Design a protein around this ligand. Structure first.
Ligand SMILES: [Zn+2]
Ligand SMILES: [Zn+2]
Ligand SMILES: [Zn+2]
Ligand SMILES: [Zn+2]
Ligand SMILES: [Zn+2]
Ligand SMILES: [Zn+2]
Ligand SMILES: [Zn+2]
Ligand SMILES: [Zn+2]
Lengths: 378, 378, 375, 375
């Protein structure tokens, strides 16, 4: 008897697959955490020591990518008792999240990029995929190596930089400071093989997107590296974001913001405005302070709403959380079900309720409950 | 015989109380430095080991909050012989001051925030309540931790930052530098649970308030965090301050400046202009250089004048020194006589002359003379 | 009706009081979070709007002071996944802890004093009392302001410095670096009105206390400012510890270390060795890697149960001895003028109620007050 | 037809397998760059789209791990013209090297860790596996982030630190500086999940290993984290090295140093001295001043040919021993779950094929995969 168990062969059979593209009833063969074949009717005996999974009647889609999470905790805006706690593995996984991008916010005094970096690594070690942004609301940026360009270029998990504009919690940055920082992130990413993006937390100032336009007039950073987030927070801002997207920018809608522009509503309007889904993403702002802390249920909720109350197809509904995110951040191997991609998959009921979650080919959630937990989860 | 002396029970009986709100003849019961009951006719035997004080015929009001004092000394503008000496406890208390905010001025070369911080702490230890501002006239700010945001966030006694504008003694700051500094103070205060204000020493430049308006156009710091002081120093400046107050800003009048706009006059005009007292404060600039050094008698003097020559009610007269200050700096437990507030009280004759002063429930002045002195007072 | 509720009058009646000193059946009156009277038979009507609590048949004693807690989390010695989570309020209060001193350990790369300082502040706001030590195992120390001397003098919650010696995770400090760091903490303590102590995490190196002795010969910091902790981790170290205590030093036994010298055992031997309880402390090392806080109370139970200690004495290492060593004014003793940090226990020493600064935190053995984000 | 080519199924059949352990004639199945099965007679049809390679009559073994390579170039000791060029991929793979650890030497003015780090990354992308050491001969170390402890904990490819002792090109380090630096690497290793080793370039000074012994008496870093290299450079040093190994240390023999103690000879004497192979490593010092990589394989040949070693044993110093010392998970042994880093040799030990992470890199003794700018 030959042992082939090292391969971790798993055959996912008979689900209706949304890659997110509708592929109909189709099988998925996994090995070594990778998707190795996608096809209708894969012989259950094509490989030895194969775990076969009957998904008949279920749906199979790619795992969500949540690009805005306060992995080590956030808050602190109303004193020290408001510092939220760190994110626990199970919370992410039960929410359908297989890939995450961690970041800092208002507080960069009691929160440090080194802490964030360690947490990012723990999460990868625990089973999912994680990256981070250097900086925080504060401009000039607080970094690990002393320079934004150096952080993006040399710290493996760093993919870009974060900042805040048009917000009463900003560092009142001027255009030069902003331009320089985005330029450093851009360059650092070429060198490091990273997207080199600049993510802008938007507040409620009436100036809205101005600073971004100013910046573009003062530098050569491509518009495709600039990401405004929390765009649904106020109407006028939302409206400008639409045009920003119309000009070739990508906009990030926050799932945790219900009013004045609800998330599904925001996505629907984009489409109405003729904006291609590829230029719209959805992120949670999870673990930030809400006093409660923002969770991850809003992601799934948005997909359900879009399908059920908005007439989106499941395929379209999935984009903002999968392919558009991977697309924007250049996350190779993620967001789509293709041979050669990582085996980050969700298994859902036809009513869009998660039953199982695979991260890198490993069963993380079964029967809608986490079977793999963070090291200190109790 | 049971000892209940630890409580320090004190009953202040029968004065006409101005909370500053007129409460008429009313009693005040104190314990553990706190006001525990305010009411007419409190039974002199409600608590054991109670010190009863007959205030019949007298007035009872809250202790003054002087938010602009050069606690460690100031001056130095005309050479080293002009460096004034540090403030002595008794000077404050005999002047009716129970709470103070220390700060630096022109000289930040021979004066350091660490010195100011130590002095602040000594004063609390000696019996009164004290806080400070980081920075000084110089922009960029000279701080303790290296950053304005960090100083406000982590040094317990630091509540904001000071600077100078439109003055021949300024560091010729540009809008960005100013904006950044105010933004840091603002943010630092959210984190630290401080007001996070920015206090602007105003000089006689013709530009007057401009820089403040410029700043607001270049940042998202709320107008309510910005405090221009010495507004009565020149007419045109005073006039602009009125409108500044009209737009929602708070203005600080300096009691030690007699011309061209006297303090009581300044306060009267504000009211004439329809500005709510809540938006007007009065501070001494005590211990700065005047060669003499500015004292604290001008505070009380202003209240007397307002009542006697201006027709203000005592209640109204008290605001700028009590509730409006506490209101502006968010000094919980101060500026008002309510159960649960600190027992910082003044006892005056009907002609507004101070007889006794209680700081945190402790008798500091009796018969208009200090009975508790600074450790080195001789 | 006049309202006097701002005073928070509370009368704890009928318990057998251990201050820690046995005081027999005695009453305790509280106002504004402070103990205002201690006597038998205080009248229930002595003050208006008084909450009377009948504790007859129960024991009353001071809240515990745990001077060795990884408040923001610790661990990380076996990689990133081993970083423990921050401590929740209820875990402390349920274990009888009303005062705590937070610190860092091995990891001072992903762990920062500024973070520790915020957490310290959070806890104070939440209802208990907390302080911290600056530095970490690493020497030179990583501080907030850039100087150990400055951190201790100016940061209100900082009371001393932490370091590691004789351990395979130390920074290989030399005597000069150790002396200087201890002297800075000492001096900062004076300027800031802090104890200005130096806390030494002890490892298993054969050199044991050597470095301390060396330090003493190289500086003039008083012996009473130097605290070796984890002294019960190995025999030779423990024995050396006894000697150090005999010379005038204080020693900290770790409740979470059960072998080779158990906590109660170590305490009993110290005493049997002629060392006064005043020079013996007990701390948990709670939240390190996740070590909990139940061993504290258990040590007390064991001392009484198996070692012939009176209750009074068994309490000292967690109350008066710590408060005394750290100069925690208002803590560790039930006296008029002190803070109302009290435990209510059954005669068999099970925690029933806990008051911190006069506020009821735990009732029927269960936290009734929780951390802001406690789930 | 269903496409399964994404898996890269490859079946290596019929070779005499040395894992390094002699396993006789046995098959190896590979998928996704990992070894998924090791057994005799694996069915050629067991998996779809399988590339079958008939290796009958050949030997199969693990790829070599060269832990001492001047990846970006070295030299510069006789002025600017002596700076050697960076290492090309094919030079490594042709020599049987599939895993490498890069480092700096004498020159840390014209040579930077950031440059070394980029080159390390380049190689990983090009198909092999690479790590680096922070620092250089200079002590205090010149690092990327400013701290040895921080470099090791946070820079993914950094696994330890390099330094020079007992050499006329050293920085004249004192024991404190050496101890501190070793302790920082040790601690960073723990936090980052790295071996956290200290690699000591040994020169010809008569003091030989002294500094190491001294260091040990001045810190608590385990002996197993300290690696003296170039130990065969002189006799007295070599002999002292044997002793150090006997005490529990590991020793690195330089394949490029032929006198006075040749590489094979040194290995044979170590063994004859009672030292287990697990505590003996072999590295090239390749690309220094331009030293090549052929002496690696030659040492193996000589051990077998002239020293009575079995093949299994002769392989250890370049495979399992290194992987074990550096904790290189997935490397140095042919086991299910490990990376497909394999060599195909003739029975007389000549390299024929080389696979790195399952990719064919060298064929018929010639690189068939080259560096991006390889000419
Ligand atoms: Zn945000
Ligand atoms: Zn956020
Ligand atoms: Zn001024
Ligand atoms: Zn002034
Ligand atoms: Zn320890
Ligand atoms: Zn500890
Ligand atoms: Zn060398
Ligand atoms: Zn070398």
């Amino acid at each position: 008897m030959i042992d082939y168990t090292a391969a971790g062969f798993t055959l996912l059979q008979g689900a209706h697959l949304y890659a997110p593209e509708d592929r109909g009833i189709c099988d998925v063969l996994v090995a070594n955490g990778k998707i190795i074949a996608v096809a209708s009717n894969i012989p259950s005996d094509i490989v030895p020591n194969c775990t076969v999974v009957d998904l008949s009647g279920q749906i199979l889609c790619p795992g969500f990518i949540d690009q805005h999470v306060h992995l080590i905790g956030g808050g602190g805006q109303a004193g020290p008792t408001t510092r939220t706690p760190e994110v626990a593995l199970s919370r992410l996984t039960e929410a359908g999240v297989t890939s995450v991008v961690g970041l800092l916010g208002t507080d960069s005094i009691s929160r440090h990029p080194e802490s964030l970096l360690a947490k990012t690594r723990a999460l990868n070690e625990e089973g999912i995929s994680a990256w981070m942004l250097t900086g925080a609301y504060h401009v000039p940026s607080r970094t690990i190596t002393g320079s934004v360009e150096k952080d993006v270029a040399i710290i493996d998990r760093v993919i870009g930089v974060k900042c805040a504009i048009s917000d009463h919690r900003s560092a009142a940055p001027d255009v030069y400071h902003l331009a320089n920082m985005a330029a450093e992130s851009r360059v650092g990413g070429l060198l490091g093989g990273k997207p080199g993006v600049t993510v802008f937390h938007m507040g409620d100032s009436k100036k809205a997107l101005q600073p971004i336009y100013d910046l573009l007039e003062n530098c050569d950073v491509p518009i495709s590296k600039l990401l405004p987030t929390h765009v649904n927070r106020n109407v006028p801002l939302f409206e400008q974001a639409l045009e920003f997207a119309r000009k070739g920018g990508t906009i990030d809608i926050t799932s945790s913001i219900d009013e004045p522009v609800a998330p599904a509503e925001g996505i629907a309007r984009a489409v109405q405005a003729g904006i291609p889904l590829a230029r719209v993403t959805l992120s949670s702002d999870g673990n930030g302070s809400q006093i409660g802390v923002a969770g991850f249920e809003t992601l799934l909720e948005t997909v359900q709403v879009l399908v059920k109350d908005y007439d989106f197809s499941i395929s379209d509904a999935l984009r903002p959380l999968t392919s558009s995110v991977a697309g924007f951040l250049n996350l190779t191997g993620k967001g789509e079900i293709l041979p050669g991609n990582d085996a980050d998959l969700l298994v859902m009921t036809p009513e869009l309720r998660i039953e199982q979650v695979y991260a890198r080919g490993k069963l993380m959630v079964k029967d809608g409950k986490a079977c793999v937990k963070g090291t200190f989860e109790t």
